[PDB]
Amino acid sequence: LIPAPPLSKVPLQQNFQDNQFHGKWYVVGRAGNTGLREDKDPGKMFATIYELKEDKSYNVTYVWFGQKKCMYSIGTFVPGSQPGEFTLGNIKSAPGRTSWLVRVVSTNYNQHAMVFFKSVTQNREGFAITLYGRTKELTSELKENFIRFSKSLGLPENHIVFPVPIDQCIDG
Amino acid sequence: AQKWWHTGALYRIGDLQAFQGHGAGNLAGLKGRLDYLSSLKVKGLVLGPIHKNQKDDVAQTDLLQIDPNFGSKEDFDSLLQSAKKKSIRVILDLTPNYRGENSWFSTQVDTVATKVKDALEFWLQAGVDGFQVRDIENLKDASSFLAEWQNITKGFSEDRLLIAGTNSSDLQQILSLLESNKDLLLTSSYLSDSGSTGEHTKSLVTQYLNATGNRWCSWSLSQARLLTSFLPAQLLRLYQLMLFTLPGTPVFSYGDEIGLDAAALPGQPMEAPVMLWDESSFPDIPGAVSANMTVKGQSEDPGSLLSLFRRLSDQRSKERSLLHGDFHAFSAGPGLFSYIRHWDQNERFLVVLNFGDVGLSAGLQASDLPASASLPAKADLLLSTQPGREEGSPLELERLKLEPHEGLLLRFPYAA
């Protein structure tokens, strides 16, 4: 087991501009402790759509290709303490429930982004890092920047996967 | 006297990393899930493969060495001793080129077969309860090799099991494999992808038993794949009831007990999905995993798929008629499949399945059974697959009405 890093090791994008971050991002890379590995099927690529709302929340939609049809799931990211941080809305208040933190680490808005995710369930913590692209492919250099950051948080390289691009569903 | 694999369900775990989800994905992690496996009342785990296999390289494949990413030979012996203390048996999958496209390799078939032959006594000495080999459609002269490997496994002890798996769905092909191998346990695609009518399922099940002398057999939808690969969500509960009450050993894969569906979340590998223990399974997609998809969430709901699996598994592993029983089928309407399980002087079970999308009167005909059987006027409802009926109370049998996709399990005592 790999323990979650302290939040003090995770950078926050300076001067975060919510209106530039909106729109469609392709999930180009996934780093975490879920069971996914570089030496086996990394899954099909999916898209995450960020729609900015009047209260500075985002409506977030996941779009993917299921068995023989397109599939959708929707949630609300509520602003946190600092620009570029969010929590998950519409959560239960039973004492065992899972809570989330989302932190945008690095983006240029029109090409790439890296985002950090942390879950908390009772006393147990989980984490991940995602590499987002405005396009389905990104350069070797950008993928290496993501590999280097993920490893600096304690993940082995074989815990880092690159989903396979597809054309069904994820291009509207 | 009754062999251990006759006493309840078998549970397949092919990808150890995806089953564990969190952490390292090793033999140590599996050991810490044994209390959960005991909650399911499963009688054996089918594990792996876990051996050294350089993909497509015959010389750098060694069935006697564990791949160090899965743990050590000491971790394996600790896992076996803890399973034994919980009365859970362990079956090792030895399919040799499990990391490549062709499971048996494309060349050197005599060398490959000898690797399996020479690994049997090594692992029986370590304390395994039996073996699985899959994709036997790609193994040249499979019926001869399987006979040889069976004779070595049973020669060690008659309480040791060999399971073979094939992608075939053809009755004649299956019969020719078993003709000189009558006691082999075989999983296959015989029941998958034939459209699902009540009448068609009844024909498949009865013709198979009639062709094989009512001998012991497995019941499954595949040698490896999840039920949701083949069935829409609304038939899952019905199929679990059928599989746990047919005469033979039922075989499931990890996640079948929560209705695990690779299509239901973004990013799941289609043939090896991550097991959903709780809402923290994929921290990179907040909001996607709902509580009703998970082990934690289903364990808190008496109406869930996991709660149904646990109850059915309990009944299958304690009721002598479901352990040992004879089987006789009715010829009910289009939409329906119905049958009775019975042994000597023990409690009898009646199963009624509505495969269709409309509500139906069952009008079951007594004379469909042999002259010596008979039914009472009423039987106590054990359970339905759907909520809202009174369990523990009698139902009148000439008057049964079943809702769309509903299954009923009724019980009645030995009367002289």
Numbering used by the authors:
A (entry chain A): 7 to 178
B (entry chain B): 114 to 529
Study text:
To identify the epitope region and to understand the structural mechanisms of the tight molecular interaction between P3D11 and the CD98hc ectodomain, we crystallized this lipocalin variant in complex with hCD98hcED (carrying an N-terminal Strep-tag II) after isolation of the 1:1 complex via SEC. Crystals belonged to the space group C2, with two complexes per asymmetric unit, allowing collection of a synchrotron X-ray data set and refinement of the structure to a resolution of 1.8 Å. The engineered lipocalin binds to a membrane-distal part of hCD98hcED via the four variable loops #1-#4 at the open end of its β-barrel. The β-barrel axis of P3D11 is tilted by ~45° with regard to the TIM barrel axis of hCD98hcED. The contact interface between both proteins involves a buried surface area (BSA) of 1473 Å2 (1424 Å2 on the side of the lipocalin and 1521 Å2 on the one of hCD98hcED) as well as 15 hydrogen bonds and 3 salt bridges, resulting in the largest interface observed for Anticalin•protein complexes thus far 71. The interaction is favored by electrostatics as P3D11 is positively charged, which complements the predominantly negatively charged epitope on hCD98hcED, also reflecting the calculated pI values of 8.8 and 5.2 for P3D11 and hCD98hcED, respectively. The epitope of hCD98hcED essentially comprises two loops, L1 (residues 128-137) and L2 (374-404), which follow on the first and the eighth β-strand of the TIM barrel, respectively. Almost 75% of the contact interface is contributed by L2, which penetrates deeply into the binding pocket of the engineered lipocalin, while L1 contributes approximately 20% to the total BSA. Interestingly, binding of P3D11 causes an induced fit on the side of hCD98hcED.
